[PDB]
Design an enzyme around this catalytic site. Structure first.
Site, PDB file in Angstrom:
ATOM      1  N   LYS B 263       0.556  -0.997  -0.035  1.00  0.00           N
ATOM      2  CA  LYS B 263      -0.076  -0.520   0.107  1.00  0.00           C
ATOM      3  C   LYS B 263       1.019   1.011   0.426  1.00  0.00           C
ATOM      4  O   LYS B 263       0.895   2.480  -0.555  1.00  0.00           O
ATOM      5  CB  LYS B 263      -0.719  -0.107   1.174  1.00  0.00           C
ATOM      6  N   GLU B 269      10.325  -4.322   5.371  1.00  0.00           N
ATOM      7  CA  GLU B 269      10.773  -5.825   4.784  1.00  0.00           C
ATOM      8  C   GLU B 269      10.853  -6.101   3.359  1.00  0.00           C
ATOM      9  O   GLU B 269      11.067  -5.920   2.309  1.00  0.00           O
ATOM     10  CB  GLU B 269       9.803  -6.725   5.550  1.00  0.00           C
ATOM     11  N   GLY B 329      -5.544  -2.003   4.499  1.00  0.00           N
ATOM     12  CA  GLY B 329      -4.434  -3.299   4.449  1.00  0.00           C
ATOM     13  C   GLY B 329      -4.725  -4.792   4.187  1.00  0.00           C
ATOM     14  O   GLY B 329      -4.949  -6.015   3.412  1.00  0.00           O
ATOM     15  N   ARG B 330      -5.664  -4.890   5.583  1.00  0.00           N
ATOM     16  CA  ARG B 330      -6.249  -6.106   5.959  1.00  0.00           C
ATOM     17  C   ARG B 330      -7.074  -6.401   5.811  1.00  0.00           C
ATOM     18  O   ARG B 330      -8.114  -7.707   6.224  1.00  0.00           O
ATOM     19  CB  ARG B 330      -5.629  -6.174   7.917  1.00  0.00           C
ATOM     20  N   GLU B 415      -5.959  -6.953  14.513  1.00  0.00           N
ATOM     21  CA  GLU B 415      -4.924  -5.790  14.020  1.00  0.00           C
ATOM     22  C   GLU B 415      -5.850  -4.502  14.821  1.00  0.00           C
ATOM     23  O   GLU B 415      -5.836  -3.238  14.714  1.00  0.00           O
ATOM     24  CB  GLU B 415      -4.002  -5.942  13.619  1.00  0.00           C
ATOM     25  N   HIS B 446      -4.993 -33.489  17.641  1.00  0.00           N
ATOM     26  CA  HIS B 446      -4.612 -34.613  18.172  1.00  0.00           C
ATOM     27  C   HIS B 446      -3.109 -33.568  18.692  1.00  0.00           C
ATOM     28  O   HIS B 446      -2.433 -33.821  18.563  1.00  0.00           O
ATOM     29  CB  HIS B 446      -3.628 -35.400  17.243  1.00  0.00           C
ATOM     30  N   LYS B 575       8.569  -0.075  14.741  1.00  0.00           N
ATOM     31  CA  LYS B 575       9.388   1.169  14.032  1.00  0.00           C
ATOM     32  C   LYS B 575      10.420   1.663  13.913  1.00  0.00           C
ATOM     33  O   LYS B 575      11.767   1.582  13.269  1.00  0.00           O
ATOM     34  CB  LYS B 575       8.520   0.943  12.976  1.00  0.00           C
TER      35      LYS B 575
HETATM   36  O1  LIG Z   1       1.374 -41.333  17.368  1.00  0.00           O
HETATM   37  P1  LIG Z   1      -0.143 -42.417  16.742  1.00  0.00           P
HETATM   38  O2  LIG Z   1      -0.252 -43.551  18.001  1.00  0.00           O
HETATM   39  O3  LIG Z   1      -0.729 -42.394  15.657  1.00  0.00           O
HETATM   40  O4  LIG Z   1      -1.142 -40.992  18.076  1.00  0.00           O
HETATM   41  C1  LIG Z   1      -0.673 -39.127  16.953  1.00  0.00           C
HETATM   42  C2  LIG Z   1      -1.597 -38.582  17.984  1.00  0.00           C
HETATM   43  O5  LIG Z   1      -2.954 -38.476  18.412  1.00  0.00           O
HETATM   44  C3  LIG Z   1      -2.953 -38.674  19.948  1.00  0.00           C
HETATM   45  O6  LIG Z   1      -4.602 -38.498  19.428  1.00  0.00           O
HETATM   46  C4  LIG Z   1      -3.274 -37.872  20.942  1.00  0.00           C
HETATM   47  O7  LIG Z   1      -3.346 -36.595  20.827  1.00  0.00           O
HETATM   48  C5  LIG Z   1      -1.799 -37.664  20.069  1.00  0.00           C
HETATM   49  O8  LIG Z   1      -1.054 -37.491  21.429  1.00  0.00           O
HETATM   50  C6  LIG Z   1      -0.450 -38.506  19.564  1.00  0.00           C
HETATM   51  O9  LIG Z   1       0.375 -38.066  19.197  1.00  0.00           O
HETATM   52  O1  LIG Z   2       0.933  -2.991   2.423  1.00  0.00           O
HETATM   53  P1  LIG Z   2       1.976  -2.236   3.245  1.00  0.00           P
HETATM   54  O2  LIG Z   2       1.728  -0.486   3.369  1.00  0.00           O
HETATM   55  O3  LIG Z   2       3.055  -2.757   2.677  1.00  0.00           O
HETATM   56  O4  LIG Z   2       2.278  -2.947   4.786  1.00  0.00           O
HETATM   57  C1  LIG Z   2       1.889  -3.911   5.256  1.00  0.00           C
HETATM   58  C2  LIG Z   2       1.388  -3.807   6.649  1.00  0.00           C
HETATM   59  O5  LIG Z   2       2.769  -3.032   6.818  1.00  0.00           O
HETATM   60  C3  LIG Z   2       1.676  -2.403   8.732  1.00  0.00           C
HETATM   61  O6  LIG Z   2       2.997  -2.986   9.695  1.00  0.00           O
HETATM   62  C4  LIG Z   2       0.951  -3.063   9.117  1.00  0.00           C
HETATM   63  O7  LIG Z   2       0.778  -3.523  10.265  1.00  0.00           O
HETATM   64  C5  LIG Z   2      -0.155  -3.530   8.633  1.00  0.00           C
HETATM   65  O8  LIG Z   2      -1.396  -3.121   8.713  1.00  0.00           O
HETATM   66  C6  LIG Z   2      -0.281  -3.893   6.907  1.00  0.00           C
HETATM   67  O9  LIG Z   2      -0.637  -3.600   5.578  1.00  0.00           O
END
Ligand SMILES: O=P(O)(O)OC[C@H]1O[C@H](O)[C@H](O)[C@@H](O)[C@@H]1O
Ligand SMILES: O=P(O)(O)OC[C@H]1O[C@H](O)[C@H](O)[C@@H](O)[C@@H]1O
Lengths: 611, 610
Positions: B263, B269, B329-330, B415, B446, B575
Site C-alpha cells: 500500500k 521488509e 491492508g487487512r 490488528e 491431536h 518501527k
Molecule cells: O502416534 P499415534 O498413536 O498415531 O497418535 C498420534 C496422536 O494422536 C492422539 O490423539 C494424541 O492427541 C497425540 O498425543 C498423539 O501424538
Molecule cells: O502494504 P504495506 O503498506 O506494505 O503495509 C503492510 C503491512 O505493514 C504494516 O506494518 C501493518 O501492520 C499492516 O496493516 C500492513 O498491511
C-alpha cells in the site's frame, strides 16, 4: 451448605482485604488475587471432587500473592532504573560445547520481577519438591501415574549411555539398536541404494501420521533445511481430509517415493485410513503402468510404531518396522524412531547433533542449581504471569523463517501436556494450569497481530527467539531482521508516554487542539509489557535440539509445580468415541434423533445436502 | 489515596448486597463487579479518563445481572428445556448460486437463553450500531483518527450503485482496476506474457507483508482446486533473507513474474525484499548472457497507492495496479492486492470471490438484527469476551485448504480491535479484541484440543466446515466431518464422574485406588461452547462470504466497544526503535544509550555476529 459457603466466602474476602498490602489505588488487584482460586474451582466444579490446597497453601505461594498485590501494577522499567546492570543479573547462558561455540542464551530481565520476587519463585521450587521429582523422572520411575508409565524421552538422546532402567532392564541397548537401524536405512536412501519397484532411487519421502507423529518431524525438517539433502523431497500427510493425501500424491513420482507410516499405537483412525488409502493408490498406479505389485509394498512402505502386530497386518515387514516404547510420549517423540524422516533429510551425523543438543540441555537441567537453571527460570517466569497476573496466553515468536512451525509444535508440547484440570492426587486444581500457545515467525507477526500485543487489553508474555548468525547471507537482511528482534522487546517494555505523543503530534502540525487531544491516547503505548529474549549463535541441529529440550523441561517444571500429570492426554478420548458413533449415522437421507437438537440438526443438514 | 479504597469497598459492598447470584456463585458476582476496575487499572498509563458510555448502557448492566444469574448454568440446560433450540439458534445466508451454496451458522451450543439473546440485541440498538453500519457503507469518514473512509465493501460492489468519497463515485475507479487486473491475468494465463528470454510465465512471486501477504496467500491456498496448476505461486514476506533465498531457489527466473505488493510502497521488509529480488534477478540474467535492457519492466509489476515510489523502482505506469487510502491492508484481498489470486484462479473465479463477499455485505446491511449473521457472531463473541472474560477465540477450519485462515483472521481481528483507547479519547472500561489462534481440523484434535476440553480456560471455538469435498477419496470426508460434529457435541456434553467410573469398572485391570485417582483425571466438565459454521462447498463465492462475514463481525464488535477498528497506531513504535537499533548493529560496537537489556542484547549480537 451453599449458604454456609457464601458466609465463609464473604468472611475470607473481608479478612483478605483487611490484611492485604496493596496500595489504596489498587484494591481491585487484591480482590482479583483473592478471587482467582474461587473462580477456578467454580469453573471446574463439574469434576465433582474437592479442591487441591497443597499448592495454594505453600508459604511461597502466599508470599508470591502478597508480592503481586504490592508490585503487580508497577512498570517494568522501574527495575532497570534501580539497578544499572539488571541485564547481567537476569540472564544466563547454556554452553552447547560445540566447535562453533554455540549456546542457548536467555534474557528474562524485561519482566515484573525484582530480587525479592525472584527469591520467592526459587523457594517455590524447594517447597514443591521439584528437584526430587526431576531426579525420579530421569531415573525412570513411573511418574506418569495415570497410565503407570515411565517418562523417558531423555533416554532417547542419552549420549552418555549410562543405564536407565524400566521394569528392571536397561533401555539404552534398544534405544541404540533402533538408532543404528535408522542410520542404515537413511544411508541407503541418501546414497541412492534404496530402489523402488521399478528400480528408481528414492527422491520423495512421504510421512503419514498425526499429532506427535507429524508436528515434530515436519517442524524439524523445516527448521534444518540448510543441513538437508535437497535431492530428497519431504512431504507430511496428516489430515484425514482427503485433500491432504490427494495433493501430496500429486506432487510425487510414486515409483521413487518412500512412505513412512508414523503411529505409536498404529490404530489412530486418521493415520491408518491415510496409510491404507496411500497403499491402495500406490498399487493402482503400479498396475496402471504394467508394473508388478509383487514385493512392492515392502520396498515402498516402512513403519514407526510400538505395535509390531498391527504393523504386520498392514503388510509391512518387521525388518522395516522401527520400534519405540510406551515411555516415549508422542509430543516427545521427535528423538525416537519417529524422527526417521528427519534423519533421511539431514543425515545421521546431523541427527546425532540434534540428539546431542538435547542431551546437553538435559545435563544442564538435571545438574544446575535452581538459581542458575535455565528451564526452571523459564517455568517460573511463566507461572508468575500465568498464575498471578492471570494471563491466559503465551506467545512464541521465532525470528527465523525456518522455525515457522515451532509455534504449532510448542502448542502440542505445552497445551497437550499441561492443559489439565485434575491433579495426580485426584483433586481439582485451584490454580491456572497450561496457557494457550500462539505465534508466527517474525518479522511477519509485527504486521499482523502485534498491534494487539502493544495496545490491547490483555497482557501477553512473549518468548522472542533468534539466531545471531543466518544460514542465508544476502544484503543486510539479517541485520534488519535482528534490529526488529531487539526493538520489539524494547518497545513492549518502554512504551511511549502521552507527553511524548503530544509533543510529536504538535511537531508534526496540521491538527487542531481538539483533534490532537482525541488522538493522543490512541497513539499512546502503556509499555510495561513483558518479554523473554532467547538467542542461539546459529540455528544448527544441535541448537534446535537444545531449544526443544529446554521447552520440554519448562513444561515438566510447570506441571510438577501445579501437581498435574504432564504426560497423559485423557482429554482427547471423548471426541474419538463420539465421532465413531456419528460416523455410522452419516448416510444420505438418514434421520437422527438421539443427540441434543444441535448435533441432530447438524448431522441431518449434512445428510440432506451431502449430495 | 485512601479515599479511592474507601469508595471501592463501599461500591463492592453495595454490589454484593444487591446481587442476585446464587449462594454458591458469589465469586462470579465479585468477578463481574471487578472487571472494569481491573481493566482501567491495567490501562492507567494511558493517562486519560475511563469511558463509561458502554458500561452505562442499560442493556450492558442488564447483561451483567443476567451473567450473575445464569453464568454458571450448563449449556445443556437450555437444550433440555427447549426441544427445538437448534431451530431457534441457527440461521442461513443464501449465496444465490447455481450450486445452491450457503453460509449456515449454528450458535446454539452457547450459554445463551432467550432473555440474554434479547438483551444482546438491545445492545445493538443502544450503541447505535445499525446507524454506524450505514455511515460506514456510505463512505463517511468513520476512521476518524486518520480522517479516512472505510470502503472495502466498494471493492466488491457488484451492484455498482454509486459510493462517494470526497463527492466522487469510487465505483468507476474500482472497475477500471479490475479490468486492468483482468487483462494482465489473462495474458499470463494464456501464455502471452513473455520473459526477457522469450519464455511464458510459469512462476509468480508475490513480495509483501501483513495485509499485502496473508490474504493473497490464504486465498490461493484455499482455492487451489480452482487454480491453473501450470503457474506456481510463491509468497515472499519475511525480511529474514532465508525467505527470498529459498523462493528464488524454487523458481526459473526466466519465467518468473514478480509482484510487489505494498500500500505504502515504503515498508522496510517489502522494499528491501523487492530490491534484493531485483538485484538477484539481474545478476541471474547476466550469468545467462541475457541482456538486462528493459528486463525489470517485463518481470516486475506493483500493487500500491504510491505512484512515485513505484515509478522510482522502475515499474511501468501500465503495470502499477492502484488501490486507495480507504482500503485497509487487512481488508485489501478484494482490491489490486488480490492480483496473484486472480492470476492463479482466473478473472471469472475472482469475480465469484467478490460476489460472495457482496452477497454477505447485502445481508449484513439489510437483515434485521435478530436475523443478522455477522451481528450474532459479534454478540456471541462479546458475551464470552466481556462477561465470561475469555481472552481468546479459536478458529478451527475442518478443511486442509483453509490452513492459513486462522493466521489471516489473526490480523483481521487482532490488528483491528486490539485497542485500548476509544474514538472519543478515553480509555476503555471493557475488554476489546480477543487473541486468535487455531489450526485446521482434524490436526488440532491431536495437538491442543486436550486443553480446550480439560484445561482451566473457557475458549470460544468457531468450527468451520464444508458439507462437500473437492477431493473425493474413500471415506475420508465422512470421517473428517464425523469429527467436526463430535467435537462440538463433546465440548458441550462432557462426561460425568458416574459415566467414567462405570467405564473404568467394566474395563477392569485396575486396583480400587487406581480407579479412584483416575476418575477425576478422565472426567470432562462439558459446558464448553462452540459455533458451527457450514458452507455447502468451499468455492470462491463461499470463501468470499466467509471472509466478509468475519470483517463485519469485527466491525460490530469494534463499534460496540467504541474503538476504531480501522487504524493501527500500535505498530509505529517498533518501527522507529528498529531503525535506531539498525544503526548500532556493527561488529564490536558498544552500546550504552538504551536500557541495560537492549544494550546487552545488542552488544552480544555485535560481539558474536562474527
Ligand atoms: O502416534 P499415534 O498413536 O498415531 O497418535 C498420534 C496422536 O494422536 C492422539 O490423539 C494424541 O492427541 C497425540 O498425543 C498423539 O501424538
Ligand atoms: O502494504 P504495506 O503498506 O506494505 O503495509 C503492510 C503491512 O505493514 C504494516 O506494518 C501493518 O501492520 C499492516 O496493516 C500492513 O498491511
Amino acid at each position: 451448605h451453599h449458604h454456609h459457603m457464601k458466609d465463609q466466602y464473604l468472611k475470607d474476602l473481608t479478612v483478605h482485604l483487611n490484611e492485604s498490602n496493596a496500595a489504596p489505588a489498587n484494591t481491585s488487584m487484591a480482590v482479583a488475587s483473592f478471587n482467582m482460586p474461587h473462580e477456578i474451582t467454580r469453573r471446574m466444579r463439574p469434576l465433582g471432587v474437592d479442591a487441591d490446597t497443597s499448592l495454594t497453601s505453600c508459604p511461597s505461594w502466599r508470599r508470591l500473592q502478597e508480592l503481586y498485590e504490592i508490585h503487580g501494577s508497577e512498570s517494568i522499567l522501574k527495575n532497570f532504573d534501580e539497578c544499572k546492570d539488571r541485564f547481567q543479573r537476569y540472564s544466563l547462558e547454556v554452553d552447547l560445547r560445540s566447535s562453533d561455540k554455540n549456546f542457548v542464551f536467555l534474557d528474562y530481565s524485561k519482566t515484573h520481577i525484582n530480587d525479592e520476587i525472584k527469591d520467592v519463585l526459587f523457594k517455590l521450587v524447594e517447597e514443591r519438591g521439584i528437584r526430587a521429582f526431576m531426579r525420579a523422572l530421569f531415573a525412570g520411575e513411573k511418574v506418569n501415574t495415570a497410565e503407570n508409565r515411565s517418562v523417558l524421552h531423555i533416554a532417547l538422546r542419552n549420549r552418555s549411555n549410562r543405564p536407565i532402567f524400566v521394569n528392571g532392564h536397561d533401555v539404552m541397548p534398544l534405544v541404540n539398536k533402533v538408532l543404528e537401524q535408522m542410520k542404515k536405512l537413511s544411508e541407503k536412501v541418501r546414497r541412492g541404494e534404496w530402489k523402488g519397484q521399478s528400480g528408481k532411487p528414492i527422491r520423495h519421502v512421504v510421512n503419514i501420521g498425526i499429532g506427535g507423529s507429524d508436528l515434530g518431524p515436519m517442524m524439524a525438517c523445516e527448521a534444518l533445511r540448510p543441513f538437508s539433502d535437497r535431492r530428497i523431497s519431504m512431504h507430511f500427510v496428516s489430515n484425514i481430509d482427503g485433500t491432504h493425501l490427494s495433493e501430496v500424491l500429486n506432487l510425487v513420482d510414486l515409483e521413487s517415493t518412500l512412505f513412512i507410516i508414523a503411529s505409536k499405537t498404529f490404530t489412530t483412525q486418521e493415520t491408518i485410513t491415510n496409510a491404507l488409502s496411500a497403499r491402495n493408490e500406490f498399487l493402482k498406479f503400479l498396475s496402471s503402468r504394467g508394473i508388478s505389485e509383487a514385493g512392492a509394498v515392502a520396498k515402498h512402505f516402512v513403519a514407526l510404531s510400538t505395535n509390531a502386530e498391527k504393523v504386520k497386518e498392514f503388510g509391512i515387514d518387521e525388518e522395516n518396522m522401527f520400534q519405540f516404547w510406551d515411555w516415549v510420549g508422542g509430543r516427545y517423540s521427535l528423538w525416537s524412531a519417529i524422527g526417521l524422516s528427519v534423519m533421511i533429510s539431514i543425515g545421521y551425523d546431523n541427527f546425532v547433533e540434534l540428539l546431542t543438543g538435547a542431551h546437553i540441555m538435559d545435563e544442564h537441567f538435571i545438574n544446575a542449581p535452581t538459581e542458575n537453571n535455565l528451564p526452571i527460570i523459564l517455568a517460573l517466569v511463566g507461572i508468575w504471569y500465568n498464575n498471578f497476573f492471570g494471563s491466559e496466553t503465551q506467545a512464541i515468536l521465532p525470528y527465523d523463517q525456518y522455525l515457522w512451525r515451532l509455534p504449532a509444535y510448542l502448542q502440542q508440547l505445552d497445551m497437550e501436556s499441561n492443559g489439565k484440570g485434575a491433579t495426580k492426587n485426584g483433586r481439582m486444581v485451584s490454580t491456572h494450569t497450561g496457557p494457550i500457545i500462539f505465534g508466527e515467525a517474525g518479522t511477519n507477526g509485527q504486521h499482523a497481530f502485534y498491534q494487539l500485543i502493544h495496545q490491547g487489553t490483555k497482557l501477553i508474555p512473549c518468548d522472542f527467539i533468534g539466531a545471531i548468525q543466518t544460514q542465508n547471507y544476502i544484503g543486510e537482511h539479517h541485520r534488519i531482521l535482528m534490529s526488529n528482534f531487539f526493538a520489539q522487546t524494547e518497545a513492549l517494555m518502554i512504551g511511549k508516554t502521552p507527553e511524548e505523543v503530544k509533543r510529536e503530534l504538535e511537531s508534526a502540525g496540521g491538527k487542531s487542539e481538539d483533534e490532537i487531544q482525541l488522538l493522543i491516547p490512541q497513539k499512546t503505548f502503556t509499555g510495561g509489557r513483558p518479554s523473554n529474549s532467547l538467542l542461539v549463535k546459529a540455528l544448527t541441529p544441535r541448537a534446535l535440539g537444545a531449544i526443544i529440550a529446554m521447552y520440554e523441561h519448562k513444561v515438566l517444571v510447570q506441571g510438577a509445580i501445579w501437581g498435574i500429570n504432564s504426560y497423559d492426554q485423557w482429554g482427547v478420548e471423548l471426541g474419538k468415541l463420539l465421532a465413531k458413533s456419528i460416523l455410522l449415522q452419516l448416510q444420505p437421507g438418514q434421520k437422527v434423533t438421539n443427540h441434543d437438537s444441535s448435533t441432530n440438526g447438524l448431522i441431518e443438514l449434512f445428510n440432506e445436502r451431502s449430495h
